[PDB]
Design a binder for this molecule. Structure first.
Ligand SMILES: Nc1nc2c(ncn2[C@@H]2O[C@H](COP(=O)(O)OP(=O)(O)OP(=O)(O)O)[C@@H](O)[C@H]2O)c(=O)[nH]1
Ligand SMILES: [Mg+2]
Lengths: 216, 51
């Protein structure tokens, strides 16, 4: 009953789902093979052969960040059908992977959603880590919310969203692809928590003692 | 007195099997399919060096 399904859109989405799932695998002991060397049933579907399958959603439009995790150190654990990405990267564009091709792949992502969540009873909520500033985790995340608002009913969804703060801006189109997804997430979200890459910076400076970190 | 309420039912969340799939998006994306078009014969013109 306590099961939660994660959704992770964007290159940022998959590489911040990866470290979080590493912490998930360390908090109750499961090897990167996915075997034993109530905490298990919420994220890991127990098999008839002792295997554990993470019931997440990892969706992208650039294969070069999701191709790594199917050839990395955790490629034994993650189900191959769930690690969805695309052929063309949206590239700071709302409409390609929403109208032309992401219209075609939201079909298969929703099929994977239906196939994953059918064996559950207690779907308690959804978790979405979307990209305001990016192209994939803006447009495809928006299409996911438009379909999920009307097909799943009044199910709780939560946003641990990222938000390009006005001081440090990686790309320049953060007022250009995030505003429409803000309009989308106003009416199609229940709780949305913003993070930024400036507050983590100075707590790592003074409160932590690590200089020159990565996003990892 | 008369005894139990029998009760029944479950929850279910997703919209059943009511979503089509034929997008040829092979997990990581729509992979391949090459499309060759018929071409023509390259030619040129003539000249007159002498006769
Ligand atoms: N908070 C946080 N933000 C990140 C992280 N990694 C990337 N970002 C943000 O993500 C933005 C980069 O664009 P992406 O989210 O990767 O967009 P994408 O998924 O590659 O899709 P496209 O825009 O179409 O290429 C940058 O502006 C960063 O601010 C991260 O680890 N933490
Ligand atoms: Mg992307």
């Amino acid at each position: 009953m306590r099961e939660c399904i994660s959704i992770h859109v964007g290159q940022a989405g998959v590489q911040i789902g990866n470290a979080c799932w590493e912490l998930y695998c360390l908090e109750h002991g499961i090897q990167p093979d996915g075997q034993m060397p109530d905490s298990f049933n919420t994220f890991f579907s127990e098999t008839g052969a002792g295997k554990h399958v993470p019931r997440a959603v990892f969706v992208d439009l650039e294969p070069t960040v999701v191709d790594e995790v199917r050839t990395g150190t955790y490629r034994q654990l993650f189900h191959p059908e769930q690690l969805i990405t695309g052929k063309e990267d949206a590239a700071n564009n709302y409409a390609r992977g929403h109208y032309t091709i992401g219209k075609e792949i939201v079909d298969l992502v929703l099929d994977r959603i239906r196939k994953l969540a059918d064996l559950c009873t207690g779907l308690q909520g959804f978790l979405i880590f979307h990209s305001f500033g990016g192209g994939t985790g803006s447009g495809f995340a928006s299409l996911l919310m438009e379909r999920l608002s009307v097909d799943y009913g009044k199910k709780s969804k939560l946003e641990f969203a990222i938000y390009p703060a006005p001081q440090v801006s990686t790309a320049v189109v953060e007022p250009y692809n995030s505003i429409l997804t803000t309009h989308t997430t106003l009416e199609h979200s229940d709780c949305a928590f913003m993070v930024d890459n400036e507050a983590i910076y100075d707590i790592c400076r003074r409160n932590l003692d690590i200089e020159r970190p990565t996003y990892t | 007195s008369f005894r139990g309420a029998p009760m029944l039912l479950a929850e279910n969340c997703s919209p059943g099997p009511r979503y089509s799939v034929n997008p040829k998006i092979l997990r990581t994306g729509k992979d391949l399919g090459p499309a060759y078009s018929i071409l023509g014969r390259y030619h040129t013109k003539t000249t007159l060096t002498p006769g």
